[PDB]
Write an enzyme that holds these catalytic residues in place. Structure first.
Site, PDB file in Angstrom:
ATOM      1  N   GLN A  85      67.582   9.862 -28.852  1.00 34.63           N
ATOM      2  CA  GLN A  85      66.871   8.586 -28.796  1.00 34.63           C
ATOM      3  C   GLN A  85      67.627   7.461 -28.109  1.00 34.63           C
ATOM      4  O   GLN A  85      67.017   6.476 -27.696  1.00 34.63           O
ATOM      5  CB  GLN A  85      66.485   8.130 -30.217  1.00 34.63           C
ATOM      6  CG  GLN A  85      65.299   8.864 -30.842  1.00 34.63           C
ATOM      7  CD  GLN A  85      64.931   8.347 -32.246  1.00 34.63           C
ATOM      8  OE1 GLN A  85      63.869   7.731 -32.435  1.00 34.63           O
ATOM      9  NE2 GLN A  85      65.802   8.607 -33.228  1.00 34.63           N
ATOM     10  N   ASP A  96      74.145   4.350 -40.774  1.00 32.63           N
ATOM     11  CA  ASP A  96      72.892   3.628 -40.582  1.00 32.63           C
ATOM     12  C   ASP A  96      72.759   3.137 -39.150  1.00 32.63           C
ATOM     13  O   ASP A  96      71.665   3.125 -38.600  1.00 32.63           O
ATOM     14  CB  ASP A  96      72.780   2.458 -41.558  1.00 32.63           C
ATOM     15  CG  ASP A  96      72.294   2.892 -42.921  1.00 32.63           C
ATOM     16  OD1 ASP A  96      72.111   4.113 -43.127  1.00 32.63           O
ATOM     17  OD2 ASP A  96      72.058   2.089 -43.844  1.00 32.63           O
ATOM     18  N   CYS A 105      64.917  14.745 -39.256  1.00 33.42           N
ATOM     19  CA  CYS A 105      65.602  13.520 -39.649  1.00 33.42           C
ATOM     20  C   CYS A 105      64.407  12.662 -40.021  1.00 33.42           C
ATOM     21  O   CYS A 105      63.496  13.172 -40.656  1.00 33.42           O
ATOM     22  CB  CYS A 105      66.463  12.928 -38.526  1.00 33.42           C
ATOM     23  SG  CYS A 105      65.796  13.112 -36.871  1.00 33.42           S
ATOM     24  N   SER A 106      64.365  11.388 -39.671  1.00 32.89           N
ATOM     25  CA  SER A 106      63.132  10.669 -39.995  1.00 32.89           C
ATOM     26  C   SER A 106      62.037  11.078 -39.000  1.00 32.89           C
ATOM     27  O   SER A 106      60.968  11.561 -39.393  1.00 32.89           O
ATOM     28  CB  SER A 106      63.316   9.145 -39.988  1.00 32.89           C
ATOM     29  OG  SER A 106      62.252   8.498 -40.691  1.00 32.89           O
ATOM     30  N   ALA A 107      62.315  10.899 -37.710  1.00 32.41           N
ATOM     31  CA  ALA A 107      61.322  11.224 -36.676  1.00 32.41           C
ATOM     32  C   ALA A 107      61.386  12.677 -36.168  1.00 32.41           C
ATOM     33  O   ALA A 107      60.432  13.183 -35.556  1.00 32.41           O
ATOM     34  CB  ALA A 107      61.427  10.243 -35.501  1.00 32.41           C
ATOM     35  N   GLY A 108      62.497  13.355 -36.434  1.00 29.17           N
ATOM     36  CA  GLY A 108      62.668  14.717 -35.939  1.00 29.17           C
ATOM     37  C   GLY A 108      62.956  14.807 -34.442  1.00 29.17           C
ATOM     38  O   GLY A 108      62.579  15.786 -33.796  1.00 29.17           O
ATOM     39  N   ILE A 109      63.632  13.804 -33.883  1.00 32.72           N
ATOM     40  CA  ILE A 109      63.983  13.856 -32.465  1.00 32.72           C
ATOM     41  C   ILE A 109      65.406  13.425 -32.127  1.00 32.72           C
ATOM     42  O   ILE A 109      66.025  14.009 -31.236  1.00 32.72           O
ATOM     43  CB  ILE A 109      62.977  13.033 -31.603  1.00 32.72           C
ATOM     44  CG1 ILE A 109      62.968  11.560 -32.039  1.00 32.72           C
ATOM     45  CG2 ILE A 109      61.585  13.664 -31.666  1.00 32.72           C
ATOM     46  CD1 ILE A 109      62.054  10.681 -31.201  1.00 32.72           C
ATOM     47  N   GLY A 110      65.916  12.406 -32.830  1.00 28.42           N
ATOM     48  CA  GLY A 110      67.216  11.817 -32.527  1.00 28.42           C
ATOM     49  C   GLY A 110      68.392  12.667 -32.958  1.00 28.42           C
ATOM     50  O   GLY A 110      68.993  13.401 -32.166  1.00 28.42           O
ATOM     51  N   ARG A 111      68.735  12.539 -34.227  1.00 23.97           N
ATOM     52  CA  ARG A 111      69.777  13.343 -34.827  1.00 23.97           C
ATOM     53  C   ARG A 111      69.409  14.824 -34.690  1.00 23.97           C
ATOM     54  O   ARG A 111      70.265  15.665 -34.411  1.00 23.97           O
ATOM     55  CB  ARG A 111      69.901  12.952 -36.290  1.00 23.97           C
ATOM     56  CG  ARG A 111      70.206  11.467 -36.474  1.00 23.97           C
ATOM     57  CD  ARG A 111      70.268  11.054 -37.921  1.00 23.97           C
ATOM     58  NE  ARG A 111      70.343   9.615 -38.080  1.00 23.97           N
ATOM     59  CZ  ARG A 111      70.303   8.996 -39.255  1.00 23.97           C
ATOM     60  NH1 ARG A 111      70.193   9.703 -40.376  1.00 23.97           N
ATOM     61  NH2 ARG A 111      70.372   7.669 -39.305  1.00 23.97           N
ATOM     62  N   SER A 112      68.132  15.138 -34.880  1.00 27.36           N
ATOM     63  CA  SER A 112      67.655  16.522 -34.767  1.00 27.36           C
ATOM     64  C   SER A 112      67.930  17.104 -33.380  1.00 27.36           C
ATOM     65  O   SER A 112      68.328  18.277 -33.241  1.00 27.36           O
ATOM     66  CB  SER A 112      66.153  16.608 -35.063  1.00 27.36           C
ATOM     67  OG  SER A 112      65.861  16.249 -36.410  1.00 27.36           O
TER      68      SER A 112
END
Ligand SMILES: CCc1oc2cc(S(=O)(=O)Nc3ccc(S(N)(=O)=O)cc3)ccc2c1C(=O)c1cc(Br)c(O)c(Br)c1
Ligand SMILES: [Mg+2]
Length: 282
Positions: A262, A181, A215-222
């Site tokens: 991010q 998290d 992912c949620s936003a599609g930028i960080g983990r992605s």
């Protein structure tokens, strides 16, 4: 290993925040006019995360071909990825339409449906074999075929059917379920294992449409996923693997979708994954 040495230098100088800010400042800025059209307001999850107009994926439907998704085309690496936001209650049909139309073999999910006690995306796939999902708006049927729950991830076989033609395709759902998290994984071990599990399946291969990553936003983990994969691929391909510069690769990817990576922590973790991935290879 040259990039390791840079890694260690940034660590010692405690300059991760500064390196990251530098990338943020140099990052591309392109228009997202379609994403901002009043009629697409309900198709976006985050006001500050939109696909650029030039690389956006268009739905093959007349009138409103809009989905919050971007095609990241890595020319040298010969890899393409579609980064998208986690589906919304009203965009699950669009999401699968895109998977169908883009001829994707795999979907890569890097978040849990609920994280930090809040919903991060819609339950867009069936959790039980006997309870299939039908997306009436895009005329698609989705059936859970099998599920393999492992330690750090779950892999699912799904069957996607185009109800208009009764054509069916097998889609692989690779779900990394252990991203913490807060912060990033202590070791890149499990994330790399996961990436190579996705590779193994053929989901990233040229014979299929681009893998769909969110992912949620599609930028960080992605961003981390595609960045690590591309850097490792380039290291295998080049005559001089030490020439692979993660910052430059990340900057190239940001020409296609904003915000990839991010936090400074995610940048550091990306280096770590690439360094360890190379060391394993070896
Ligand atoms: C290259 C992909 C990869 O990179 C890793 C890095 C680690 S690590 O972070 O723990 N570092 C590491 C571990 C072990 C060595 S070793 N065995 O060379 O001494 C080197 C580095 C663990 C596991 C992996 C790992 C894999 O799990 C993996 C999975 C699959 Br499927 C593969 O086909 C490959 Br190749 C590798
Ligand atoms: Mg059952």
């Amino acid at each position: 290993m040259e990039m390791e040495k840079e890694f260690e230098q940034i660590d010692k100088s405690g300059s991760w925040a500064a390196i990251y800010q530098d990338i943020r400042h140099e990052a591309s800025d392109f228009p997202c006019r379609v994403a901002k059209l009043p009629k697409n307001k309900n198709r976006n999850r985050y006001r500050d995360v939109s696909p650029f107009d030039h690389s956006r994926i268009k739905l093959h439907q007349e009138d409103n071909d809009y989905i919050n998704a971007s095609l990241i085309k890595m020319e040298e690496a010969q890899r393409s990825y579609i980064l998208t936001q986690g589906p919304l209650p009203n965009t699950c049909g669009h999401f699968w339409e895109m998977v169908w139309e883009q001829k994707s073999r795999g979907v890569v999910m890097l978040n849990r449906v609920m994280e930090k006690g809040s919903l991060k995306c819609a339950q867009y796939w069936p959790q039980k074999e006997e309870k299939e999902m039908i997306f009436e708006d895009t005329n698609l049927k989705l059936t859970l075929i099998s599920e393999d729950i492992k330690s750090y991830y779950t892999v699912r076989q799904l069957e996607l059917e185009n109800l208009t033609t009764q054509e069916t395709r097998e889609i692989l759902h690779f779900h990394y379920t252990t991203w913490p998290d807060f912060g990033v994984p202590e070791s890149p071990a499990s994330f790399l294992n996961f990436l190579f599990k996705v590779r193994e399946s053929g989901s990233l291969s040229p014979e299929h449409g681009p893998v769909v990553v969110h992912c949620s936003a599609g930028i960080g983990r992605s961003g981390t996923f595609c960045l690590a994969d591309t850097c490792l691929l380039l290291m295998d391909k080049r005559k001089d693997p030490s020439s692979v510069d993660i910052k430059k690769v990340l900057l190239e990817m940001r020409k296609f979708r904003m915000g990839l990576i991010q936090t400074a922590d995610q940048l550091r973790f990306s280096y770590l994954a690439v360094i360890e991935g190379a060391k394993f290879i070896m």
